[PDB]
Design a protein around this ligand. Structure first.
Ligand code: ADP
Ligand code: MG
Ligand code: MG
Ligand code: MG
Length: 319
């Protein structure tokens, strides 16, 4: 009899190349069978009809019924790789930053502007031509403005008058672009936002991908905070740069993975001013186009499953 690992996510994710690469490798474990829950079943069937599993790998993305995944986990009590309730919090940048602070993790100085959509002028914002004051806290330009929804990627950077003013509007990468300059110098006046200090990097962001708290792959890409043209190679793949995490950063990854209870977890680091600042925690995310990562990730995940469950299945497993 096999230990069943259930994969529960939207089809765009469950059928993605990186997912398939990892699942084929997990299936190589003699005592593990992988079951990928059909999207039609996730959306349309009650949880009582979902397939059984002993270990559940499940994560929210656009369109995913997290309430149902939570109810399923409560019903069946599988070993859960990425905690489901924490995925409600990962959707809200305010909650993410609160957790990071509680863990003593360095992050940009920030302030939350909560705006009542019925009374949008009543919020705690004062605006000058070269700064904002949010709950009384001053942010001189350049500063960053992020929608409180972590699913909203319309992050704006505001340039100081000394640099010509205006703003950089970032967005989910569309073909050749990740951002565009706007002459608009004043901040958005509807919605709630986090305002934060701009951290000067060498022009790259470091992307970190954990598989448990003791494995983290990192790589760098050109910051969209720059001009916004995406760098691509011959095959049309976005250019990435090699990164090795230092001791401080390996600890950050350990903390993020455990604090958010996401075994598989992606987050962003800004290397600025001799330190490394977390600016974004995304939860479930795989590295793409690395055979070594696919090998390592599947081995780690299978080993986690076996360590946890081999005893109750009476399967021999050493340490
Ligand atoms: N405080 C900051 N200082 C400098 N750059 C930042 C800062 N915050 C975010 N950025 C830039 O904006 C990009 C997008 O912001 P991020 O918080 O990662 O939002 P998203 O969830 O949309 O990926 C980051 O990858 C980084 O290039
Ligand atoms: Mg197998
Ligand atoms: Mg990000
Ligand atoms: Mg994000």
């Amino acid at each position: 009899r096999q230990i069943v690992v259930g994969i529960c996510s939207m089809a765009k994710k469950s059928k993605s190349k990186p997912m398939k690469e990892i699942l084929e490798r997990i299936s190589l474990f003699k005592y593990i069978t992988v079951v990928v829950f059909e999207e039609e079943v996730i959306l349309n069937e009650p949880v009582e009809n979902w397939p059984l599993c002993d270990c559940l790998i499940s994560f929210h993305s656009k369109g995913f019924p997290l309430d149902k995944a939570v109810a399923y986990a409560k019903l069946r009590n599988p070993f859960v790789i990425n905690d489901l309730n924490m995925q409600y919090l990962i959707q809200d940048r305010r909650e993410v930053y609160s957790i990071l602070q509680a863990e003593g993790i360095l992050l940009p100085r920030y302030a939350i502007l909560n705006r009542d959509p019925n009374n949008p002028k009543e919020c705690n914002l004062i605006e000058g031509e070269d700064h904002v004051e949010v709950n009384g806290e001053v942010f001189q330009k350049p500063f960053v403005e992020k929608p409180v929804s972590a699913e909203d990627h319309n992050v704006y950077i505001y340039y100081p008058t000394s640099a010509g003013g205006g703003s950089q509007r970032l967005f989910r990468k569309i073909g050749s672009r990740s951002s565009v300059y706007s002459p608009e110098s004043n901040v958005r006046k509807t919605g709630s936002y986090i305002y934060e200090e701009f951290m000067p990097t060498d022009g790259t962001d470091v992307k970190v991908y954990t598989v448990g708290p003791d494995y983290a792959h990192a790589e760098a890409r050109k910051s969209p905070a720059l001009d916004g043209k995406v760098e691509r190679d011959s095959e049309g793949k976005e250019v990435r740069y090699p990164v090795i995490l230092n001791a401080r950063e390996k600890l950050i990854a350990w903390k993020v993975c455990l604090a958010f209870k996401q075994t598989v977890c992606g987050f962003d680091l800004l290397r600025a001013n001799g330190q490394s600042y977390v600016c974004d925690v995304n939860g479930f995310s795989f590295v793409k186009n690395s055979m070594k990562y696919y090998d390592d990730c599947a081995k780690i995940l299978g080993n986690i499953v076996m360590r946890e469950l081999a005893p109750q299945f009476h399967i021999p497993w050493s340490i």
